């Protein structure tokens, strides 16, 4: 098996405040095939400059997807008072062909922080935490989002210095605010920037310890840590489940600026994943310390044939989704990105 280190000795889990309505915002970001948003490069081989049609799991063009945002906890000027999270834990999302995440989209811009409408801070890139399980169950209190045995959990750590992925059984602690405990809230991760994000004070398992209080790790199959540089530049994360194993794709590892997705890690899980839930994250910081954070976008993938344009570097600058519309279908028929205007076959 694997060792996650000593379990948290905290008597009770920290109280969580759920404000889904405050978190909800109008932020539409449709997938743009033209800019090759969320498309994985063919893993088999590099391709020639001439445009080549390729068939793979791909997000629908023009699909906004699901938007999730992480915001700082309610805080008095002297100290933080309570965690602030949405109702993401209750929400359960079906996993079929896997999903692609948009990270750092709102970074490098200034927008009001979710916790205070009056307060405005520069938005900074933040990294989402995802829990994927073969099966899901109701919570002891009857809330949705409880996860069964052998559920994979991925959490970024050290303000995004490293990413930790582990597939382990989850056991709720009996402490209050934990799922087994009275007044149970929701599974969540909490970090303090001064305690860990300050240089030389980084804690390798700080995110794991906060998750451990809500759910203990029992008989974990394996624990894997991958170190990813933290950058404001937009990056894409892709996760899919195959019989050979789970595949992890990071844009930052190969083409951070391009946004093209290339597999960086292989996870040996042969169990099919049918359900995934986003894990809400709360930042424990004072009101001055609290800053706006980027909102992650999740897009489901479905098998489709996409015209692919390859640069001399070979990166896919642009793509065409034939299924999206009749105009794209005529481009797909000719297998050419640009075609002379003509009458074309239609449904």
């Amino acid at each position: 098996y694997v060792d996650v280190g000593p379990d948290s000795v905290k008597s009770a889990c920290i109280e969580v405040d759920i404000q889904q309505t405050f978190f909800d915002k109008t932020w539409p970001r449709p997938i743009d095939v033209s800019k090759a948003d969320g498309i994985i490069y063919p893993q088999g081989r590099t391709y020639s400059n001439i445009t080549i049609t390729y068939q793979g799991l791909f997000p629908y063009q023009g699909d906004h997807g699901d938007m999730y945002v992480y915001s700082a906890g309610h805080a008095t000027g002297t100290t933080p008072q309570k965690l602030f999270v949405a109702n993401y834990s209750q929400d359960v999302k079906q996993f079929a062909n896997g999903f692609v995440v948009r990270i750092g989209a709102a970074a490098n811009s200034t927008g009001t922080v979710i916790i205070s409408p009056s307060t405005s801070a520069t938005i900074r890139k933040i990294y989402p935490a995802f829990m994927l399980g073969s099966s899901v169950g109701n919570f002891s209190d009857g809330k949705m989002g409880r996860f069964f045995n052998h559920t994979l959990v991925l959490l970024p750590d050290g303000c995004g210095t490293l990413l930790r992925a582990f597939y382990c059984i989850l056991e709720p602690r009996s402490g209050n605010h934990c799922p087994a405990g009275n007044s149970y809230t929701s599974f969540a991760t909490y970090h303090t920037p001064a305690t860990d994000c300050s240089d030389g004070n980084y804690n390798r398992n700080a995110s794991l310890n906060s998750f451990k209080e809500y759910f203990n790790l029992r008989n974990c199959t394996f624990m894997y840590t991958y170190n990813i540089t933290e950058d404001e530049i937009l990056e894409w994360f892709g996760i899919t489940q195959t019989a050979q194993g789970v595949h992890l794709f990071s844009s930052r590892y190969v083409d951070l600026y391009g946004g093209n997705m290339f597999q960086f890690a292989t996870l040996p899980v042969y169990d099919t994943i049918k359900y995934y839930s986003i894990i809400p994250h709360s930042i424990r910081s004072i009101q001055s310390d609290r800053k706006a954070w980027a909102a992650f976008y999740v897009y489901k993938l479905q098998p489709l044939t996409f015209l692919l344009d390859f640069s001399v570097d070979g990166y896919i600058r642009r793509a065409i989704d034939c299924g999206f519309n009749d105009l794209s279908q005529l481009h797909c028929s000719y297998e050419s990105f640009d075609v002379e205007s003509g009458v074309y076959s239609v449904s």
Partner: antibody
Amino acid sequence: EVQLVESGGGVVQPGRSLRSCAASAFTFSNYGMHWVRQAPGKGLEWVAVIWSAGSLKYYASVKGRFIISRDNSKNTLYLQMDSLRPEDTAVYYCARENTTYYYETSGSWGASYYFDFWGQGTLVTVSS
Amino acid sequence: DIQMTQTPASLSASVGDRVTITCRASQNISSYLNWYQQKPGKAPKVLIYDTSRLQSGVPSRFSGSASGTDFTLTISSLQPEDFATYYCQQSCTTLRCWTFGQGTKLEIKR
């Protein structure tokens, strides 16, 4: 706003089954119910504790003699007493207990407790 | 289990006097200890929860400090109404059983 009352306490023969506590105008579903027993010549102790879910029940000086079942829709918690003895017989109080929340890094403290409306108690007596 | 005995079963104290009440557990299983003040016809009240921060709704006159296994409560400006039986409970999340205070009755010394 919390309302707590205990019912079904009565004089009983030894080795008898006696049905408890009721709650009104309160969020009983998310709050665990704790039963405490006081008898003359001995200090207050918690005879039985049940979680808000009610899946797990803890009994504390008896071999699980007390049986506790709570219905949140009913808003009433049912306690069963069996093999009752004169020394065992005592007034029983039902109250909801919530542990205080604390922040380790800043030392910040949140009371997070609902000890209000502690049960008045019901007296059960064994006599011959 | 835990064996707890309060050092005085009953304490006689004059009005407006400074006195210490000590309850000693077999061992201090947890930092949190719930002191309880009981008045006949009145529901039990938690004087202190962890012995480091006073419980809300409790007067500053009762202060609980624990040295070693023994836990000591310090009271000043005693009053006839203030006098009440004192119970101390050691609370441990792992242990289902909850400690019961022996009880100390307070009467005037004169």
